[PDB]
């Protein structure tokens, strides 16, 4: 059984970063080299392991999280980061073992007149936990007074739409991002290389 990475990487539709999607990978053989050597990604960072040794390793599980952000935010998808993306949308553990893979997706996510379909969370009472997912859509209470389900003074909608315009600079562009997380449990390893 070859690991089904095309289903995640070639998925026709990607989630907004606040409702990021997750698939689990187990009991298969992954060929990382064909992803790494592919020339289809502008970022392929790894944490905890060298990308050149991935085909020699075995893991208990793999998790493929995927979403869309802007390019100039791919640096926030990494342990120890801060800001709205890492704090209210997608947090990585300090001891993250995995790899982050990102690419400009104007191919599929460009829209004449603008694409405002991708959203990110703006406010939160506390920071996310590593791999927590907040998809709620309740009004955010930024004051001592309850909001009672409506906007008002100190009461704001918590999500913001990216203004992906064809005219934008190279950093304010839609980037599809896939995070492979390698599970290092004290268990049999079911996902190995060739």
């Amino acid at each position, epitope marked *: 059984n070859l690991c089904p990475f095309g289903e995640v990487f070639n998925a026709t539709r990607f989630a907004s970063v606040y409702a990021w999607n997750r698939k689990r990978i187990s009991n298969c053989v992954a060929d990382y080299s064909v992803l790494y050597n592919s020339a289809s990604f502008s970022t392929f960072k790894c944490y905890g392991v060298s990308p050149t040794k991935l085909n020699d390793l075995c893991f208990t599980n793999v998790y493929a999280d995927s979403f869309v952000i802007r390019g100039d935010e791919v640096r926030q998808i990494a342990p120890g980061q801060t800001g709205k993306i890492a704090d209210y949308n997608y947090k990585l553990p300090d001891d993250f073992t995995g790899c982050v893979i990102a690419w400009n997706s104007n191919n599929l996510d460009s829209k004449v007149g603008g694409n405002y379909n991708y959203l990110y969370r703006l406010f939160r009472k506390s920071n996310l936990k590593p791999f927590e997912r907040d998809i709620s859509t309740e009004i955010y209470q930024a004051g001592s007074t309850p909001c009672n389900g*409506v906007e008002g003074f100190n009461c704001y909608f918590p999500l913001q739409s990216y203004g992906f315009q064809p005219t934008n600079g190279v950093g304010y562009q839609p980037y599809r991002v896939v995070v492979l997380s390698f599970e290092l449990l004290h268990a049999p390893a079911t996902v190995c290389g060739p």
Partner: nanobody
Amino acid sequence: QVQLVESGGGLVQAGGSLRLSCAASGFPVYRDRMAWYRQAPGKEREWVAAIYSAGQQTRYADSVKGRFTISRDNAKNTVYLQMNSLKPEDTAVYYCNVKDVGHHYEYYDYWGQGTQVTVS
């Protein structure tokens, strides 16, 4: 460049109705949030209604919760506010509003000129 134009207000005797229009250009009308606000003479700008692309689709202030209905039209890139059962208390200038984020992660609030609604 982003642009919002309100239209459709005017003079109405109580119990009447109007349909305010917000013509948007520079951005698709399907997006995170489009809101309608009120400013009466002497008072401060008041949030009235809003439509969203995630979560509950429409929200309304308590004072208009059974009388107004907000809707979007993607063909004409417009957002409508149907106001029924109008009262003198609804008399104000009506604005539509969107919040955009920019290249430097800054937020800016766009508004139109507004339309006057007078009820008697």
